[PDB]
Every structure is written in structure tokens, then in C-alpha cells.
Amino acid sequence: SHTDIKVPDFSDYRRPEVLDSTKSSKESSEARKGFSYLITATTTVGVAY
Amino acid sequence: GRQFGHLTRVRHVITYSLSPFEQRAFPHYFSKGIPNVLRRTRACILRVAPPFVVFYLVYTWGTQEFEKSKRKN
Amino acid sequence: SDLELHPPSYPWSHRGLLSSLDHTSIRRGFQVYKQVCSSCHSMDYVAYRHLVGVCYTEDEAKALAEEVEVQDGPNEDGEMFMRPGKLSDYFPKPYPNPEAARAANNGALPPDLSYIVRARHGGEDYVFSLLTGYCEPPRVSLREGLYFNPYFPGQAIGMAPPIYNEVLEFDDGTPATMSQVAKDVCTFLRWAAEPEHDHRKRMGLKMLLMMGLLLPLVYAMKRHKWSVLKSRKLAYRPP
Amino acid sequence: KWLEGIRKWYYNAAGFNKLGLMRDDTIHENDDVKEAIRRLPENLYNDRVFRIKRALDLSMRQQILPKEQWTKYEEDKFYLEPYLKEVIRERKEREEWTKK
Amino acid sequence: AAKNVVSQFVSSMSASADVLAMSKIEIKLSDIPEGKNMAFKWRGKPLFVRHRTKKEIDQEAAVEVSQLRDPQHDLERVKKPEWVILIGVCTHLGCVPI
Amino acid sequence: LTARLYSLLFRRTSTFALTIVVGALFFERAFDQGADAIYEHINEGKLWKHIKHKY
Amino acid sequence: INIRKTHPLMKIVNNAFIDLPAPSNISSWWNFGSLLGICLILQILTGLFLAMHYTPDTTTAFSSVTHICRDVNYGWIIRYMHANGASMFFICLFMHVGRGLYYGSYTFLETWNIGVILLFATMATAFMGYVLPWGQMSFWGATVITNLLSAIPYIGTNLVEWIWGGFSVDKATLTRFFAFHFIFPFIIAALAMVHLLFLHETGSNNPTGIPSDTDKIPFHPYYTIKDILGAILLILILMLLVLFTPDLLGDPDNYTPANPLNTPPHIKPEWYFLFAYAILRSIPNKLGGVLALVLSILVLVIMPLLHTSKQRSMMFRPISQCMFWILVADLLTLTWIGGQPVEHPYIIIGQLASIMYFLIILVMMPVASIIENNLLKW
Amino acid sequence: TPDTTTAFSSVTHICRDVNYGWIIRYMHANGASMFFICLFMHVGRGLYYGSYTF
Amino acid sequence: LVDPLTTVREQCEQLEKCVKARERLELCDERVSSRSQTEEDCTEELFDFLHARDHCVAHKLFNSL
Ligand code: HEC
Ligand code: HEM
Numbered sequence A: 001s002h003t004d005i006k007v008p009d010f011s012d013y014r015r016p017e018v019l020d021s022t023k024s025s026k027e028s029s030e031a032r033k034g035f036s037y038l039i040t041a042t043t044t045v046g047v048a049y
Numbered sequence B: 001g002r003q004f005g006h007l008t009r010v011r012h013v014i015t016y017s018l019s020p021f022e023q024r025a026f027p028h029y030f031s032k033g034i035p036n037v038l039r040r041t042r043a044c045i046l047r048v049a050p051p052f053v054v055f056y057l058v059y060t061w062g063t064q065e066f067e068k069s070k071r072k073n
Numbered sequence C: 001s002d003l004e005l006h007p008p009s010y011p012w013s014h015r016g017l018l019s020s021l022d023h024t025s026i027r028r029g030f031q032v033y034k035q036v037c038s039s040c041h042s043m044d045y046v047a048y049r050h051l052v053g054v055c056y057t058e059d060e061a062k063a064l065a066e067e068v069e070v071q072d073g074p075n076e077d078g079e080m081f082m083r084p085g086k087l088s089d090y091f092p093k094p095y096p097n098p099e100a101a102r103a104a105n106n107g108a109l110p111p112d113l114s115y116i117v118r119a120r121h122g123g124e125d126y127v128f129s130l131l132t133g134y135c136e137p138p139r140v141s142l143r144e145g146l147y148f149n150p151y152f153p154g155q156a157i158g159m160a161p162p163i164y165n166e167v168l169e170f171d172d173g174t175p176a177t178m179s180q181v182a183k184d185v186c187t188f189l190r191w192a193a194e195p196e197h198d199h200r201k202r203m204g205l206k207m208l209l210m211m212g213l214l215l216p217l218v219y220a221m222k223r224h225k226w227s228v229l230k231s232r233k234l235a236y237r238p239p
Numbered sequence D: 001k002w003l004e005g006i007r008k009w010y011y012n013a014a015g016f017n018k019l020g021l022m023r024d025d026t027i028h029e030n031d032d033v034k035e036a037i038r039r040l041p042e043n044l045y046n047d048r049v050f051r052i053k054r055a056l057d058l059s060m061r062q063q064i065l066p067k068e069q070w071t072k073y074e075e076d077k078f079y080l081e082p083y084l085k086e087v088i089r090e091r092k093e094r095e096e097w098t099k100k
Numbered sequence E: 001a002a003k004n005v006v007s008q009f010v011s012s013m014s015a016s017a018d019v020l021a022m023s024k025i026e027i028k029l030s031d032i033p034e035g036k037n038m039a040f041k042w043r044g045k046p047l048f049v050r051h052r053t054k055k056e057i058d059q060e061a062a063v064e065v066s067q068l069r070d071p072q073h074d075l076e077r078v079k080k081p082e083w084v085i086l087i088g089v090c091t092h093l094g095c096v097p098i
Numbered sequence F: 001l002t003a004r005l006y007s008l009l010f011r012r013t014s015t016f017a018l019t020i021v022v023g024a025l026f027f028e029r030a031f032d033q034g035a036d037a038i039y040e041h042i043n044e045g046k047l048w049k050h051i052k053h054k055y
Numbered sequence G: 001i002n003i004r005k006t007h008p009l010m011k012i013v014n015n016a017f018i019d020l021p022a023p024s025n026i027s028s029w030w031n032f033g034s035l036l037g038i039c040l041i042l043q044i045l046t047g048l049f050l051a052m053h054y055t056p057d058t059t060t061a062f063s064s065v066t067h068i069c070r071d072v073n074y075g076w077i078i079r080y081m082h083a084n085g086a087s088m089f090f091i092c093l094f095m096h097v098g099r100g101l102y103y104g105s106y107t108f109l110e111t112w113n114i115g116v117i118l119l120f121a122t123m124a125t126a127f128m129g130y131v132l133p134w135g136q137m138s139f140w141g142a143t144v145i146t147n148l149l150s151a152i153p154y155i156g157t158n159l160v161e162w163i164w165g166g167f168s169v170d171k172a173t174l175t176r177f178f179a180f181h182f183i184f185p186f187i188i189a190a191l192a193m194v195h196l197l198f199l200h201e202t203g204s205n206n207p208t209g210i211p212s213d214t215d216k217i218p219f220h221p222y223y224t225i226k227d228i229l230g231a232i233l234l235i236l237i238l239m240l241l242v243l244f245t246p247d248l249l250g251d252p253d254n255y256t257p258a259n260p261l262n263t264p265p266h267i268k269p270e271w272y273f274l275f276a277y278a279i280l281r282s283i284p285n286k287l288g289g290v291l292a293l294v295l296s297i298l299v300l301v302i303m304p305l306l307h308t309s310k311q312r313s314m315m316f317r318p319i320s321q322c323m324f325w326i327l328v329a330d331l332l333t334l335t336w337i338g339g340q341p342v343e344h345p346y347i348i349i350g351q352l353a354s355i356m357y358f359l360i361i362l363v364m365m366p367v368a369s370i371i372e373n374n375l376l377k378w
Numbered sequence H: 001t002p003d004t005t006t007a008f009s010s011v012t013h014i015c016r017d018v019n020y021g022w023i024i025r026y027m028h029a030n031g032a033s034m035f036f037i038c039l040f041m042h043v044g045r046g047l048y049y050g051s052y053t054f
Numbered sequence I: 001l002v003d004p005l006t007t008v009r010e011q012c013e014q015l016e017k018c019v020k021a022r023e024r025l026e027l028c029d030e031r032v033s034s035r036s037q038t039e040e041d042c043t044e045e046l047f048d049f050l051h052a053r054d055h056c057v058a059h060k061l062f063n064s065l
């Protein structure tokens, strides 16, 4: 029953860098985190100014 | 109304959630957003607008009748 | 009658959503107001320090203030002498009292030109058409004490048409038609109504560049942190 | 009779067969309806909270179900009405006992 | 003690003494031409004195009185039939009529 | 391009505060330059600076 | 264990802003709570600066306001923030009320009644503030509404010579309205806290009307950034309104000084009070007019006592949905008719719009509700 | 009325012409003095009986 | 002096609406000359002519000025 539980496939939703199962996550984390933190940083700069 | 924990009672329900750094910001924002907004528009204008076209007719007709009352003189 | 007439839409130079006033036109309009319109009306809340950096320099401001001597307090004797007035004066009121204003006209209190742009329905186009469209009645004679001008509620003004083709002939070439003097006095009345049209449009431009910057990006952060609930999925297991 | 045609068109256009809800998933809850919800078998109650959680999910995304999973009027398994009738009858009996 | 403190505060919000210093005047009617109204300030409200036409008197004597929600003849409203002296404010909600 | 940016200015918090301050100052400078540039580019002519240059 | 869950202030902040269970469904219409809060503190701050530069007397009030808008640095933008923030405050207030009436959130009783008391308080506060600039429209608005208070027999005339500060609109009237406009938003803030307290007692709503006890998500950090987004949208609308067309909503007829002799032809409120003035002058009776106005907002009090349906929202009831949109168009019609002169087609359709307003609320909602209760076999 | 020409005249108008405005003015001033009397009694209690362990 | 405004006003009334308004004012002149000693005294015709004429003036003036 708990072995019958298979997580569904979110391939419509993932970022294009992490589409395949082969490519790892530790080798491409910093670009994704830096993009989202860049958005938050530009928001913070606009609010502070 | 209180804090978490003692609200409801749920049996077996499984929720999956992906990481936000894992997935894209806007998933297909111009291939599903346009059919969704056209669908939600088509399912509401027939209940919202037929009072407002009556308001538009009242505005135009009242303007025309005030000009009727004043443009003979 | 009570058939009001809406004044037309005139293509001004301050009509657009970012355009500014013409400061040379404000200066010409102020020369008009000094030599024509200041004999009857009053513009109480326009001091000479408003004219220092906007249109003139500072030197001709002192010149224009020392042309007209106004008033001062006691000279330790209680006699209220005449001061030339350096820069801090408001403009000289022609009539002291409202009763004094009625006591030289056919009743008819002259309205105060600080706010006539912002105070009447229709902007400075109303003042343009009121200064312009002096014409004749078809059949209605009223009392021959007042004059006819159709852009007016009541349709009979008590103001003589104060322009009539080169009464000023001011500094540069620019010959005084009806059009030049009316355009300059409408521009000047818009300036005296809103003293900070230019800085308002400046902050409006900076703000449109703000809401070009922030509005994709705060919405991007909202979409990012709400991108967990927009993709969570459910399943129902019974025993 | 055509009033059943009105009822079928109304159940189509009412908007609560769109989100996968049945008839008694949308009931407003005063004290009586809270009692009638507490008086339920376990399987119907779990199916009820599951349909309610799917409805809140689908209205959060403002996406409405495909054609093959709308609840249909022919199989309207309305179930909460007998317990709710029993609650109303016992409540009115208690009210009448207080009145006399 | 409580009702006397409340009475003193309500009487503090009632009026002043110098506002109660308003009394009579005399008004001249010689300046007004035919058929026109002149206003005078009195107790913070305008004060109408209007010269009228005898034809306006005749028309106003021709119009009926029982349709009016306050029945009053024109000669009940004025001593000399054309020089009418009014407190120039509408008695509904405080406006000056045109 | 992005990896160096995350490795420098977004791991620690104090460096993030330092770069939002420095970015706000640089944005202040360049933004006021662009704002006065555009505003005295769409109102060329009828503005007090050129009329001052007449004098 | 933690700083937040033991400290006496941070338990309040925790049950308000961090771990408040909010439903995972509320649309953009549930942003106007925070938008009214941000507008209220923005009104308090910008009005406090205006009150630092203001001299409340009938000789020098208009002169002092002109001194603000010319001589004090940035007094013109702070004054325009205050006025158009009042306008956007009532936009978000009527959208807040429209949400709470449409989605069946008037099944809450005590939150709804404290809401209506807040509506009374904000309307009285904004009227006293509109009296404060001491223009021609402010003078005659004060005069006519004080005589509207004098309309009631046996109570009225003494009460109105009592709040006149004399026998007309004298110095004392301007100073009284300065003081009450300058105190009442703090009472509005306290009753807003009481409003929010009864809400956090009961629990919020959702667009379905189904109780959402299964799917509460915490307030922080989902709805906090959602309300930041709503606040940025509100500030850009407010600031474009004050920097491009500041006169698009305000009255032209304010800017003349207060002459008590003229009585201009086109007397009108500022645009948010048009329908209150449209119910008044479309009934040819004094007590009937003022009583019909008070009965309009008391009809908003009445509204929880006519929830005879068995769903909660109006999402699932299309007949009552169409009748609610008729009600919205009728209120906008009342606003337009109030913002006009008074002649024969305007007289007729003003009377008809007021009649149809009362007929929609007091009759058509339960008739639509009983056709709903009949039609789904209940 | 806060205006430096007529502020003192406005306070004199309160004290002389308005009904009981003199009782309200003196009540405000002497209530401020009694307010600070009660405040220093309060701080003296709070220091003397050792309530400053809170 | 060569006025531009009177030039624009004399050259803009060629349009058909202004022509029809001109004949409206002239027929009202014929009317009150015909039904002489009356209390209906040519309002709408003159206001409509000024309406149309000053709107065509508004369309095409400030280029010249
Ligand atoms: C003395 C003869 C005047 C001179 C010179 C100018 N104006 Fe005048 N103006 C005068 C009077 C007596 C009145 C009042 C008439 C009335 O019935 O109000 C006016 C009126 C105005 C108005 C307001 C009219 C309205 O729309 O209600 C304006 C805008 C105005 N005047 C402007 C104006 C200007 C710009 C002048 C200089 C060119 C000027 N007036 C000269 C008397 C006199
Ligand atoms: C003084 C102005 C008001 C303020 C500042 C205010 C503030 C708020 C806030 C902050 C909330 C919680 C957030 C939300 O649910 O949107 C709220 C909820 C609510 N208010 Fe008000 N409110 C005001 C006036 C009113 C009025 C006039 C009513 C109508 C009587 C009203 C009825 C409600 C209702 C029904 C809710 C609950 C809505 C829900 O849970 O979905 N409020 N208000």
C-alpha cells in the first residue's frame, strides 16, 4: 500500500535545467537560487529607494 | 478560528508539493491564461453586463431627454 | 435662459500627460497682468519670490518690486509710510474693501485671479473663450450697464473687453493680437493656479519608471512564493 | 413536467457540479447542520471532506474539471437530507415542549 | 454630581456670550430699482428687500391659495404690496434662493 | 553570471544588506540621470534652463 | 522554546500576522482589509502633517491652506495624498462591503454590526474633514446637513443650535469640526481592532462559502506578500491620481473663498456621498428624506436577518447573483443621479432608482432565496 | 485657534466669554499638575517597594 | 494689425454644420422680425452656431499661433 504510492510527474512545471533525471541538483542549484534571490534583491532595492 | 491542530479530522489524504526553487515562475502563462480568462469571462458577462447595458441606455436616454427638454426654446 | 455653453478643447502646450508649461509665455502673461488686468482684479496669494526662479531672474524681480511701493508699519511714530518692498510682498491689492470694489463698478465684485483656472467648470479654456468671444445679442437688451458674452452663466458679464489689438506691445517682436495676449494670460493663470505643474510632471515621470520596474518584480516574488500552492496535488487513500 | 427541465438546467448552470461537488457539499452550517454533519458514517464523511478539499484546491487555482468528471444530475446521491430532517424534527419537538 | 457636570459641559458647547450680542438694525430701501432684490447681512443670514412689479402682484392675486401647503395670501405676506421684505433663506435646509 | 552572483552576494545576509545599500545608491544616481534626461528631452525648448542661457 | 510563542506582545502578533490560519482560497477581494488599514494609517500620517501646517479659524483657514499648497515644501503633494486618499479609502470601503455582502459573510453577526458602526464613523469623519477647507461647497454642505439634523421634531432645533456653535456657521463650527475630524480616526482605529478581534474569534470566509476548516494555510508569508502586492497597486493608483489628474475627482467649486451670500447653482457633495444625497432630494418630504437615508444604512444593519437561503455564498445561486448585479448598477445609478441637477427626467428616475433599491433589498433577496430553496428540493 | 496673533486672545476668550470654559481651562491645567503628582507617587511606590524586579 | 484669430474665424465657417447654423440664426432673425414684440428671442440658434464655429476653431488654430 505504501509501496503502491508513486509521486506524480510534474514535467510541465519544473525549470528547464532540471528536466532530465540524469542531471544532478548540486551542480546547478546556484543559478536558480541566484535568479530568485536576484528578483527579491531588485524588489528590495526599489522599495528602499 | 483557533491555532492549528484541533480543527478537523482527515483520513487517508496524500498531498504532494514541489519546491519553489525547483519549478518555474510562470507555468505556461500565455497558453493557458488566455483560455482561462476567456472561459471565466464567458461564464460571467451574461450575469454581470445586462444590468450595465441597461445603465448605459439610461445614461444615454436621460442625456437625450434633457437635451430634448432644453433644445427647443 | 440657462443654456450654458461648454468651452471647446484647445490644444495647449500643457495639455499632454507629460508636457510642461512655457516659461517665456508665463513671463509674457505676467507683463500682461501687470499692465492690464491689475487695475481691477486681485491675485492675493502670488508673492514676488514665486517669480524669482520660475520665469525671471532675481534682478528684474527686485526691479519689478521696486517699481510699485506698497506699505509698511510704524516708523516708531504711527504714520504708516510707503515702502518700496524688496521681494517678500504679495501683489498690491487695488481695492481695500469688497465694498470698495463694488463702489467703482456696477456692483460686480471682481473675482480673484489666483484660482479662477481651478475654480470654474472648464479650465483655462473657459478664460480664453471668456476673453475672446465678445459678440452681440440677437434680440435681448438687458439694461445697457453690462456687456454680452455667451460663455457665462447668466449670459451678461460686467467686464469691459480689456484687450483690443496692441495695448501693450511688449519686449520682443511678438505683436499684441488678441491671440497672443489671451494665450499668454491663460498660461499665466494656469501657472498662478498651480505653481508646481513642472515638478508634478517630473515626479509623475519618475513614478511611471518606478511602476515599470517594481510591478513585474513584486508580482514575480508573489508568483514565486505562491508557486507552491499553485501546483500541489491530492490523492485519496481509504483503508 | 417542464419544471424538472428547469431543475436540470439549473443544476447544470448553478456552478456546483462544475467543481466535482454533489448536492450536499455546499450546505451552510448553523448548529443543526453541524449536528447533521457529525451524524455520518465514516466512508461518506471521508469522501465528503475529500471532495471539499478538491473544491477548495480547484477554486484556488480557478481551474474547473474536465468533461468526464463533472457530477451528473442523474446520479444525484443526496445523502445528508435524512439526518438533517431528523435534527429539525427533534429540534422542533424540543421547541414545542418549551413553548407549552 | 454627574448630571451637573454633564449639564455644565453641554452648556459649554451651547453658545458664547458675544454670539448672543446680535440685535436690531435699520435698512434703507431707496436705492433699489424696479423688480430687483438687495441683500443685507443680519444674524449670519442674508436679508432680502425686493422691489416688484404691480403686474406680479396681480398675477400673484390671480393664483389660488388652497393648493399651497402653507395657505397665505400675498397681502398677508407684505404691508406695501410690491416692496417685499424677507429673510432670504429657504426654510427647508438653509439655502439662498435664486 | 548568476552562479558567481549567488556565491558572493547571497549566501551571507550582511553581504546582501551591503549590496542592496550599494545598489540603491547606484540606482539613485543612474535613475535621477535618466529621469531628468527624459523629462528635459520631452520638454525641450520651453524650459527655464535654456531661457536662463539666453541671459 | 521560542521567542514568539511565549512573549506577550508576540503572541498577539503571532495570532494576527504569522500563524493565523487563513483559508487557501480567498481571491483579490480579500485584499481590501489590508488596503483599508494602509489607507487609514496613510490618512493619519499625511493628515498629521497637514494639521501641523493648519490654522483653524474662519478668517485664515483658506489662507493657511493656500500657504500649505504654495509655500511649505511638498505641502501640495501631502494635501493631495490626503484628499485622494479619502477618495480611494471609500473606493476600498465600498468594495470591502460589496465582498462581505455578496459572499454571504453577513452570517457573522457581531463583526457585521461593528462594521456598520465603522461605516457611520468614517462617513461622519470624512464629512467633517470636507467642511475643514472652508470653501463655498464646504460652507453650504455644513449648513444643509446641519439643517438636516434639525429636520427631526422635538429634538432637532435645539440640537442644531447646540452644534452650530452659535446661530449659523461661525468660527466655533470650524473649530468644532477641526477637533472632531482630528480625533475620530483614532476611534475608527480602535473599532477596527475590535472588528478584527471578532473576526479572529470566528474565522474567515472563502469564495465558495463552504467552511474551509481542512485547508487553512498560515498568513505569513503567503498573504503578507499578497497584501504587499495589493498595497503597491493601491499606491500607484493613488499616486497617479495625485500626480496626473488631481482635479478629476475633486470639486471645482471648492476653491472660491467662503462667501455666505452667493449659493452657487451646482451644489453637490464630494463624489462618495452622492447616493446619500440622491435618496434625500428624490423624496418630497423633509422627515421622510432624512428617515429614508438613516433607514438605508439601517437596512445594511437589517441584512443578516434575511439570510433565508441554505447555501452561504452567492457563487452558486445565479438568480440572486443577477439580482445583486442589478443592485450594484442601481447604486451606481443613484450616484450618477445625485451628481446632476434636478429636472423632470432626473426627478422621475431618481424616485424610481430609490424605490428599486429598497425593492431589491427588502423584497427581491428573499423571493430569489425562496425560489432557490424550492428549486433544489429542500 | 492656534495663530500667534490671536492665540492668547483666543485663550482669554475661552476664560471670559464661553460658559464654564474657565472651569475647563483651570481643570486642564491643575489636572496636569495633579497628574504629575500622581505620577511621581507612582514611581516612588515602584522604586521603594521593589517593583523594579519586573 | 493683422489679426490671426479673425482670419481663422472667417476661414473656418465654410463647413456644412456652420453653414446650416448660419441659416438657423437667419431664420430665427426672420422669426422674431416676423412675430415682432415677442418673448422668445433667439437663444438656441446663436448658441449652436457658436458651438459649431468655436469647435472647428478649436480643431485647427494653434498651428498658426
Ligand atoms: C475693470 C474694468 C476690469 C478689468 C481691466 C478687467 N476686468 Fe475682469 N472683471 C471685471 C469685473 C467687474 C468682473 C465681474 C463680472 C461678473 O459678473 O462677475 C470681471 C470678471 C472677470 C472674470 C470672471 C468672470 C466669470 O467667469 O464669472 C475673469 C476671469 C476676469 N474678469 C478676468 C480678467 C482678466 C484676465 C483681465 C485682464 C486682461 C481682466 N479681467 C480685466 C472687471 C475688470
Ligand atoms: C473602517 C473601515 C473598515 C476597516 C478598516 C475594516 C477592516 C477589516 C479587516 C482588516 C478585515 C479582515 C480582512 C478581510 O477580511 O478583508 C475585515 C473583515 C471584515 N469586515 Fe471590515 N473593515 C471596515 C469596515 C467594514 C464595514 C463597513 C463592513 C460592513 C458592515 C465590514 C465587514 C467586514 C466583514 C464581513 C469582514 C469579514 C470578511 C471575511 O472574513 O471574508 N467591514 N475588515
Ligand code: HEM
Binding pocket: G043, G044, G045, G046, G047, G048, G050, G051, G054, G065, G079, G082, G083, G085, G086, G087, G089, G090, G125, G126, G129, G130, G131, G132, G133, G181, G182, G183, G184, G185, G186
Ligand atoms: C486623524 C487623522 C486625520 C487628520 C489629522 C486629518 C487632518 C486633516 C486636515 C488638517 C485637513 C485640512 C487640510 C485640507 O483640507 O486639505 C483635512 C481635510 C480632509 N480630510 Fe482629514 N484628517 C484625518 C483623517 C481623515 C480621514 C480618515 C479622512 C477620510 C478618509 C479624511 C478626509 C479628509 C478630507 C476629504 C478633507 C478635505 C480635503 C480637501 O478638500 O482639500 N481625513 N484633514
Ligand code: FES
Binding pocket: E090, E091, E092, E093, E094, E095
Ligand atoms: S430646497 Fe432644500 S434647502 Fe431650499
